[model samples]
Each structure stands twice: as structure tokens, then as C-alpha cells.
Target: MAITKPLLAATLENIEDVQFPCLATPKIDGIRSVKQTQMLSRTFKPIRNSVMNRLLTELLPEGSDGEISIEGATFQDTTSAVMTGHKMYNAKFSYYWFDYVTDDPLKKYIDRVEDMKNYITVHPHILEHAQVKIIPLIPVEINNITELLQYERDVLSKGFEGVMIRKPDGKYKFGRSTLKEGILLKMKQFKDAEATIISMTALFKNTNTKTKDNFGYSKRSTHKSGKVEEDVMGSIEVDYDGVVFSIGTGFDADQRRDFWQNKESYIGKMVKFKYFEMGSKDCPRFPVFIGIR
Candidate 1:
């Protein structure tokens, strides 16, 4: 049985059923594409005589079965550590580990080879290390700014790098010898365009507000505001420069109590003009809100 890249739906839905322990890490959102040329060759070398070139060659041999070994190699110190020790040898290595590495440790190391074998059994397109898989979150069809804005909201919610847009029906094809096809695009948000707020109950002193104690009746009064739209505040939507963004902070605070009280009504409401661009797999990067219309 050969390992292959599982269908998108099958991979997402039955990821757990592949008999391998799912690597617990954040998923990277980007455009998915196939490599059009050979990425490894003995002629290419890295600085300090690193094993990168050698490893790439072994993993992507000319026309071999695509198998290699790292028996005594210290993958931990190498630049390709993630690809070599954790998810390089198996046929479906990259596909399985798309959600593996993070800012943590336990999930970083290779616990056993059985896990690799299980992963390979289900995805046959994953051959030994010859081919590197690049999956994008945003589709390649979106070009309009409207679609890009919506995409930004979705990607930020998932904590991803952002959206990557490629040419529609673009093929996976890039190499040292080939020129770029101008099919790929990326978009991220700026810090000044977004803000994080906190939520509270009593009228806490406003940090951004300069007015001195304007709202009287300030002694933490919990008077009944039954079903009032002013009792809920989950998040805030901001729009900036034709862009739209949502800030999920300040959901529970004193100064923000009024917004929190009416949080329910704002559930599905578009926050305003936050700008966001789409990537290959419909992923949103940093989105900024311009302001309400």
C-alpha cells in the first residue's frame, strides 16, 4: 500500500481515523500547490556544508522509490529538523503534520514510527521525501476586495498567517529554473488598524476615555436591565481603508458593560470595514477595520 494525499474532505473529516496519532498543532493556512520542478539536487548546496542539500537529494532522488534514513543524524539542530525527524520519511508525511509543530515541545518530537506507518497507509500520494506539499487555505478564484474583506475575518478567527490567493486552477509548479507565474498573492493586517478590548461589569475607569467621571451612579450598581440590548458585548467590529476587522477583547468589563449588555444583537452584525485579503485556501491574515459606514 502506498501513501497519498487524501482528498480535502476526507483528510479534514477522517483525519483522526487514519490510524496515526494526530499531531496536535495549529494548522497553517495558505494556498495549496504542487511543485512543478525538482526541489533537490546534489549540485545545490547550503552554507556551512549543512545537510539540507544532502537530505533534499536523498528524499527526492532522481527516480528512485524515494526513501532515506536519519539513523544517527541530529535532526534537532538542523534547519530541516521539522521535515526530517518528524514528518519527512513517510509517504504522506507533510500532509499528516500540517497541524503538528507549534510553540510547544511534546507535540514536536517523533514518539514512534507506527504513527508514521499508519499515516502512510491512508494517504498514498505521499511518497518518500521526494515531493513537498504546499496547501493554501484561501482559494485562487477570489479577486474582488469585497471577498477579500470577508476572508480576513475568517482567517484571523482561526489564528492563521492570513489568506493566499492563487490563479484559478493554478498548478503546483515552481523551481530554480522556472519563472514565477504571478498566480500567488498574500495580505496581512497592520497593528494600528486593529484594537483589543476587555469586558467588565462595574463602570471601570476608561483608559482610552479622558472625560473625568461623566456617568454618575458609579458605585457598582447591578440594577436590573431586563433583556436590555445594552447588557451584552462580545466583540467589536472596526473598519478601516475599505477593510473590516473584529476585535474579541473587552467582552467582560465595567466601561464596556453597555456594549456587553447588547452583545447578542451584535452576534452576526458585520463589524464595519475591516480589510482582509484571501489566500489559496481561503485563509485570512491580519485584518484591519476602517470604520463604520
Candidate 2:
């Protein structure tokens, strides 16, 4: 059997139509894993975390035909040494499991969460260690959007990146989902916007590489006419309602190479980028590409 694709969340910008007393979980800042039977990312990248791999393999309920899917995160070190090798800090890394997959796609999410709670009941020893945990769900009762944001602030106060508001009776779609009547809704610390791609540029080589530009996140040169070598795509320029900026992050090497080679296909297309804040001149501060919209 092939590996299953996890259900993805849609961003929640408004709450006017949200039903009262919805389920919300604290969002973890880390890599999402579709694991328990296999250790792979949502994008299908192979992950190597022996501690998490072993624990889930042992503690997870014996069902789902040994291909149990899970909704969890491997906390800390998003780009650090998480893909390969066992480091000393690996022990400190956390793995929080929130939901599990069942054979029935129409199973209620509330029931799925109940099975997770049952796992904790069966294995009482799991509570002793902080390395692995079952995420807690908070029933949010908000009469208005201001109250919803207030509840978000309470979750953030506990060091969570954001909140995941989900419908208790929503069914698993087994793929990317949009915010509708009863589906997953996501809220993060940063805001996201759509922009039209203007241009693509290559990395700018620095003469002084030792003390300056040491992190290897070399800036992309703006010069269009210059003696270029390799011409690899480092970033793409975009204009969001007259606020122009360049997006260099949130892309892997393969995407950078592929998009750069096929620049003509993506130029002038709509791209979704995330930003920390709307800064002076209405420019997006710390903008990173999310995906092609």
C-alpha cells in the first residue's frame, strides 16, 4: 500500500460565520510529519528522527493496517540537522501528536481525537517524558471575532506559534482543504498576501565571504545585465498593490532551480507570500514566498 497524504489547513482570516464552541489546538512551529508507519514529510521528503520514529512505532495503537497516519510536528530546527544524522540536541527535540488516521475517511475528527486520548490511557508511561506529548484541545466559546482573537492571544501566551480551529465533526479529506462550513482553519503569527511576480534573479556573490555573508543566504543581485555564472534562481521580485519586494525564503534548492529554469511560465503569475508586518511605504517586512496562487 502507498503512504497516505495528510489533510492540510486553510488560513482563517475572519470568524463572522464561525460556529460557537469549536475545537482549537495550539500550533507547533516545526516540520509536519506523516508518520507512525513511515517517517516522511507532507511533501514526501524522508525524515530521520530515530527517537520519534521508535516511540510512535511502539506506542501507536495496532490498527490501520500498519499504515497509521498522524498529524504531528517535529519541533525545533526547521532547517537544522533534522533530515540526517543523530545529534546531541535530538533528545531535546519535541514531537506532539494531535490526531490519528483511521480506515474510514468519514470518521468524525472528535472520535479520532478520542482514540488519541485512548493511546494515552493505554500507555500511561508516555506522560513521564516531555519529549513526546499529546496536544491539548481547547473548546473555544466566542460570541464575536474580538473574542476569538482574544482566545488566540491566550494560546500564544503559552509559546504556541498560533491556533488551529477545527470542526469537531469534520471528516478527513485526505488532501489540501479550504475553509468552509466544517473544515480545518489556521491562524498564524504572520499575515499572508498575494502578489504578482515581476522578475527572478540569481544569487549575488560576495568578494569577502569570511566575515560578511557567512550564512550562505547570499542576496540576489538586482542587475539584469551582468556577466552571470550558473544563473541559478535565488529570489523572485513581486509587487503587492504597489508595494514591491523580493522573496528568497520558503523554497528548497530543487524549486529554486526548477522555477529559475522555467521563469517564463511563472512571470506575471500570482504568488502568495507571508509577511511579519506591513512596514513603512506599505512594504511587506520579512516577506517569504508561500506558494503560487
Candidate 3:
């Protein structure tokens, strides 16, 4: 429970120009947790550990000390989990450590820092009684731009998110502050399309819970109370074939403002959308608003 967010990788504007020899760790799909504690921090701690949570207590193992993040994708009982036999509880976690941080974090934490990575190969579930692994970072070698492109295609073909990469020698840094709008370079497969904006189910506005809409219920009560709470609406409810879903993400500040200013004009309007993949179901797996069509 001690480490801050681990160092991040800024997106490489020119992925083809990625320096000759850098490690490429594929980003895994899952829920990310910044901190994990093994047990009670102190006897004089503010509260007892017993009543806190049994789930985490059993999930994390004793002697699991380190500053790291854990990502739980899906429990093993689930479809993909069962088919893959990934690990305990049917889920495996990925880790990135801060203790591996040093005056030279990359060298000590990554290259020669093979303890966790090596451990997982043999005994994956030991560190945390919860079965998990130190995500293996594969060093990618490229002879030319074509080779790099091939590598990207190979990863994508395997159904993985593209890649997480950075200059191997670069020191640990934070935020997108490094070189561009990123300290970490995340290259993923994203596609865009168009959809019709069906007015909206309406999302909470102003980020304050105390305000009430025309229906006289607070924003928090929109679902609980029976009425319309249409204040500056648009989280985007759309229908695709027989599939209906709402996309509340991927809006820019200007788009949000524009939509709020002209909510009446947008109902039943077609809008552009972005998504990672096409789903067999009637909807995109993770649909996000692009802009009004």
C-alpha cells in the first residue's frame, strides 16, 4: 500500500522509429489496482483487519511486500478463464514494481530484475496467494521499419493490445509530461465508425450530487426516483440493429460543450463513434463517442 503510481510509458509518436533494442511488454486487458497490502499495517492501526475484507486478505499472500500494481482480468471460472486455465480463482495478475526503481530503474528493475518474471515461470502463484505473474517484458529487436511493422501485426493477430514501449535507457518519469502527451507510449488497435445519437438516458451534470433537475430529484436520484432529470444531457444512448447501448466516453471538452448548448438539435442525429473491435453481439464491445455525424 505504499507506492505511488508506477512510472508510465509515453506513446512513441514514431513507433517505426522505436530505438533498436527496447523491451516491449504487451498491455493486458483487466482491472488495474495501484496498491495491494498483505495485512494490518500496525497493531495500533486505526481499525482491525479482520472486519476489513476477507476477499483481499485471502487474495494476497504473506510476505508479499513490494510496491506494485495488480491487474485482475477475469476469474478462472469464466468462459475464457476456464478455457485457458490461466491461474487461481481462474484469474492471473500482471505486475510492475517500484522497488525495482533505483537510480537506474530500467537496468535494475527490468533487464537484470528477473526475480518476479523468473518466479512466475516456475511458481506463479507464490508471491500473492492470489495466482498472478510478473508480466513478461519481451525485448523486441528490429532490423528495419518493415520488421517492426510485422512485429506489430503479429501481436495484434494474437488478439493482444498493441504494445507498451519507451526508450530503454530513459529514466523513470511521470505523467504525459515527458516528451509529448505521454510518458508512456500505448499503441493499441482502435477503429472508428458512425452511430445515431438517441437523445440520451442522461448523465449527471456539474459533478455535484445536491443539484436537482426539472423533475425535482437530485442528480443522484435520477434512477431511484421516477422522472426525467435532463440537465445538460448526453452520455449517448444509441441503437445498433437489435442491440441498444450507451457510450459515455471519448468526448472532447468542445464536443461536450457543443452538445450541451444544442441538446434539442441533436436528438436522433447520427454521430461518429470509436471502438476497439466489432462484436458478434449487436453492439461494439467498448463503444465511445467520437462526435456528432
Candidate 4:
């Protein structure tokens, strides 16, 4: 059965917050799909791929239902396949069925996964399909943060995007779980560095569409009391060893005002930011400001 909604996971920042000996699986860097006669994306958009749909039909047939995470050779490959057109490129991708669709909303996660294994075992055609994969679940036990960190490294070394940590007895719940006990958590590697603030921008009120930069940096010009007023700072352009980028997030309203007011004081001062990876042009992918270092 196709899920009514895809279950969401809260990010795991501190490993100490979770219980030990939990279930973890590779976090596929792919698009989310709920399998049916026709496949639907996580946003409930129809995926118009005849080849992928044909493969799903052969693998599960009509009555089968589950969430199948799809990944291409690259993340862009999968995204491009869905967006540009289905026939634009060769539809070679991997489908990871991580869990079985269960009507029992309160069913334990481990038990649901067990059922998934049983179904795959009974229907052996999944193994024969080169593109289809049952995402392997691993039991993770750690005494401290280092052990958990090492576990993530091991999974990343194997070319997985990251590791998803799920509570062993967590009930199937739709939406993000912020509760401590019933949690679905993900851990991905990121790099952090200190950079010097070069310049800052302000987020202006819309004279037109109120456009902002890629990092949300913009200028504010609003009509107040028949006079134009300035708003808070938008983002600061930072230079990390000559690799310049803008960081707009992580600044609150107060910080924005203060930073912009005393903008010169912050010039050439070190600030921290984190990024998933570096791009071909040496710019960091998804660079976010942490704080002034």
C-alpha cells in the first residue's frame, strides 16, 4: 500500500541524546517515492517514468505497497530525470525499499522492517532486479560519541550519503518526530571552517518583488512616516582562504541589526560556517553561518 504521507526524520546533532543498540540504515541521497501501480514523489507529484514504472510493476505487481527511495548515479541525475523529462537520459538508477507499508500506524519500526525482509524473501524477484534494492538495516551499538562517529564514517566510506538512526521500538508515525523516544534521526558528515567577513547586505522591503541574493542578502528600503527606513542585515559575504561565499542564515533579527549597524567592526573578523562539501569552483555547497569565531 502506498503511504498516505512520507515519514520525516529529525536531525541527530548529539549522539548522546539517543539510546544505544538502535537500528540504522544508509541514507540514500535520492528522491522519495511511494510505490504503487504508479509511483508518486514525496510531494505527491506523479513521476512520469515509463521505464521506472515498468520495473516497479514487475517487481511488486499491483497489490504490493511500500516506500521506494530512488537514487541515480548522481543526485542531479535523479533530479534531472524527474524534472527535465523522463526520456531526456538513460533511466539507470537504484531503488531502495527501506520499509514495508503498514496500515498499523502504531506498528514498531523493527517489526515493520522485519516484515519487509519477509516480503522480499517470499518475493525473490527483487533480488534479481539490478535496479531494485532492499536497503540494508544495521544494528548500531555504541558506548559513546566516538563510536557513533566512527560508525558514520564507515557508512560514508562505503559511498552512502549518511546513516539514518531509528528507534528500535519506534511506532510508525507520519511527520517529523521531535520526541526523544520515538525518533527517526539522520547523521551526515559536514565540514566547518572559520572565514573573515568581507561585506554584508540588507534585506529590503519590496519595491518590486523584494528579491534577495542566493544567501538571502539584500537591502531594505521601506516607506515609513513618508521617509525610507532601513531594515536588518541580510547576509555577510565571507572569505575562507580566498574562497568567497555569502552566509545569510543563522542570524537573528537582533544580530542582523547589530551586525549591520556596526558592519565595519565585523569587517575582516573571523566567523564560522559549515558546508556539506566543496564544489568544483571551490565554493562550499550549502554554506551556513555558525557564529563569529
For lDDT, candidate 2 versus 4, the one ahead is 4
> Which candidate has the highest TM-score of all?
4
lDDT (10s digit) by residue, model 1, range 13-61: 1112222211122224322211112222121211122243233433332
Question: Which residues of candidate 4, in runs, are more than 4 Å off?
Answer: 48-50, 57-72, 130-147, 204-230, 278-282
Q: What value of lDDT does candidate 3 attain over all alpha carbons?
A: 0.47
Write down the TM-score of every candidate. 0.26, 0.60, 0.58, 0.77
lDDT of 4 by residue, 1-293 (tens): 44555677887777677676677777877677666456666655566675666566677533233444444255555665555445543444566666655557577877777777777778877767665554535345454567767878888887777887878778656567774853688786778888899998876545533555422446445555334336778888888898888898887888889999999888989998888871223577778888887
The candidates, ranked best first by lDDT, are 4, 2, 3, 1
Better of 2 and 4 by TM-score: 4
- Against the true structure, candidate 4 has what lDDT? 0.67
Clash counts for all predictions:
70, 0, 11, 6
Tell me which of candidates 1 and 4 scores higher on lDDT. 4
Which candidate number maximizes lDDT? 4
Compose the digit string of candidate 3's lDDT tens values, residues 1-293: 23233455554556554655544545544322222343322111211223222233443332222222234332222223323322234334344321233233335335433443554556555445534444434446444556667777877776555666545444444223254433246666667777676665454444334665433445444344444454544486776544677887877666666777777777788877777662224467778776665
lDDT for model 2: 0.63
Worst 10 residues of 3 by lDDT: 40-49
